[PDB]
């Protein structure tokens, strides 16, 4: 039963990659995440077993809210609706809760209200190249960036206006590669990751040590 | 023809480069390699044979003697050092042999300049 060691069964697992909070009375109460696979070390190491990858994206959002302190004699906030906007690479990006970018028709968005099943959206392989690259030995100049790996950005905000009390919401983004194809195996990462942007490392031993060659 | 006459345990590489007439002689191993050349490994072969091409001013026959004319050169360079085991002499010698290879011909018999 070698089926569980296939590329699909190895990489097609949902994982929480990003976590953020946003309140509804700040003008800045919006969460953003540039989609990248280097956020989580465990997922980064599993993807870096290969050089070139091609996969689809399935995103599931777990949004929960919590009541913040207020002075109102009575608070009776209705059900909250949230907007999750996906900005494709090169699309307009918001800087405030009230911004035109939130209404761009070419920026697909999901409107979801609390109490239902969590929202879910899928993004396909959107690179002008033929595959994503986990390693790039060259310059774009910055070494090893390869801007052909841009996957877009996600934005989240409250749709409802603020009522008689603030509401703070937290969003958990779940990331799942689908229909994955991998090329050019590479040695597993041995040194601890130091920076999210580069492969920099501090030299470490090859393995754990024993007392002598004869144990 | 070049014959390596070192010990059977000596190893090394030589770059034999041919410069066509007009082109200058190489000044470095790199320049020699960028031109027409053969890498000669004495550890694998004891002899190397090169047949330099005719290449003349569409003259078919050319003068035996010459005057400040494009000549064409053959040169040899150390690709690697001579690797030798213990108790084996590193200093060796090479012998060169010459002969006519392709359709050689002569014309207009004359007196040899070597006699008084």
């Amino acid at each position: 039963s070698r089926s569980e060691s296939s590329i699909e069964n190895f990489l097609c697992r949902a994982a929480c990659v990003y976590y953020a909070t946003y309140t509804n009375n700040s003008e800045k109460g919006y969460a953003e995440w540039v989609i990248n696979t280097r956020q989580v070390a465990q997922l980064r190491r599993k993807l870096e077993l290969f050089t070139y990858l091609r996969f689809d994206l399935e995103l599931t959002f777990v949004i929960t809210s919590a009541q913040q302190p207020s002075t109102a004699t009575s608070v009776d906030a209705p059900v909250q609706t949230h907007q999750i906007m996906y900005v494709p690479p090169g699309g307009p990006v918001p800087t405030k809760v009230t911004d035109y970018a939130w209404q761009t028709s070419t920026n697909p968005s999901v409107f979801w209200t609390e109490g239902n099943a969590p929202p879910r959206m899928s993004i396909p392989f959107i690179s002008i190249g033929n595959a994503y690259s986990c390693f790039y030995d060259g310059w774009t100049g910055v070494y090893g960036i390869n801007t052909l790996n841009n996957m877009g950005t996600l934005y989240m905000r409250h749709v409802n206006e603020a009522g008689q009390g603030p509401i703070k919401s937290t969003v958990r983004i779940y990331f799942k590669p689908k229909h994955v194809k991998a090329w050019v195996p590479r040695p597993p990462r041995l040194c601890q990751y130091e920076k999210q942007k580069n492969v920099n490392f501090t030299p470490t031993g090859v393995t754990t040590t024993r007392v002598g060659i004869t144990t | 023809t070049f014959m390596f006459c070192g010990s059977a345990m000596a190893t090394g590489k030589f770059l034999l480069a041919y410069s066509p007439p007009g082109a200058g002689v190489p000044k470095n191993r790199k320049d020699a390699m960028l031109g027409t050349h053969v890498i000669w490994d004495v550890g694998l072969q004891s002899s190397c044979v090169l047949c330099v091409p005719w290449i003349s001013q569409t003259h078919y026959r050319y003068v035996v003697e010459d005057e400040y004319t494009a000549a064409g050169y053959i040169t040899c360079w150390y690709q690697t050092n001579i690797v030798v085991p213990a108790d084996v002499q590193s200093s060796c010698d090479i012998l060169c042999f010459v002969s006519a290879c392709n359709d050689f011909s002569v014309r207009m018999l004359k007196d040899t300049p070597f006699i008084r």
Binding site: G129, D137, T140, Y143, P185, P188, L190, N200 | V83, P85
Partner: protein, 239 residues
């Protein structure tokens, strides 16, 4: 038996029964715009001297042949190109010398920097025809833009003993002295700019250090010969 191979105006000799490692089971082929066949020749780089304290050498591929004849000329002429390679590595050693070499070609060998916040500069990442040497010590962090050249991490933060996953050949002096690796074109795009991206990195790392008795030659030359295969570039004319 000795086999002589001539490519263009260059010729080299190899042991007839030498084993060739094909990179990933794929031979270099043409893109299924403008090819060049005068580049199809052997480029013998400068030989390096394997010593007792040698840690290793590496050469970035496109860059190593950037100052060699028409291939370099084509590199500055055309903006885009793609090519495979055939790499010959040969050692000249006697039967009184001992040592083991790993000859591996790493695709997209992105290397780290000694300073964790910066990235290595081009000069430290590649020396063109000149070889870059690994170090058996750890480069200090004070250094700002040098490659972390500790051999046991191979400059990539991985176990050096795991480099065998990449197309490779072992050179055990008591058994063999030459290696031949045929590397196809590997990229995420059909064609790329050869001056800003090094597709391949050839590495030679001594796993067993060179040893010899007094009197023997205190060095073993290593010769690298690279022949571009199925090279082709972008067109420059109208439609």
């Amino acid at each position: 038996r000795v086999r002589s191979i001539t490519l263009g105006n260059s010729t080299i000799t190899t042991q007839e029964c030498a084993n060739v490692v094909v990179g990933y089971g794929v031979w270099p082929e043409y893109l299924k715009t403008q090819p060049d066949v005068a580049t199809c020749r052997f480029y013998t780089l400068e030989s390096v001297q394997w010593m007792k304290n040698s840690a290793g050498w590496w050469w970035k591929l496109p860059d190593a042949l950037s100052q060699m004849g028409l291939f370099g000329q084509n590199m500055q002429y055309h903006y885009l190109g793609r090519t495979g390679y055939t790499i010959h590595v040969q050692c000249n050693a006697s039967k009184f010398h001992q040592g083991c070499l790993l000859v591996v070609c790493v695709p997209e060998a992105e290397m780290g920097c000694s300073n964790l916040n910066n990235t290595p500069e081009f000069a430290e990442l590649s020396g063109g025809d000149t070889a870059r040497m690994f170090t058996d010590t750890q480069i200090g962090e004070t250094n700002s833009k040098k490659v972390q050249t500790a051999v046991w991490n191979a400059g990539m933060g991985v176990g050096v003993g795991n480099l065998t996953i990449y197309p490779h050949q072992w050179i055990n002096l008591r058994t063999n002295n030459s290696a031949t690796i045929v590397m196809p074109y590997i990229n995420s795009v059909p064609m790329d700019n050869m001056f800003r991206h090094n597709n391949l990195t050839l590495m030679i790392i001594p796993f067993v250090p060179l040893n010899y008795s007094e009197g023997s030659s205190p060095y073993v030359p290593i010769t690298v010969t690279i022949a571009p295969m199925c090279a082709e570039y972008n067109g420059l004319r109208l439609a």
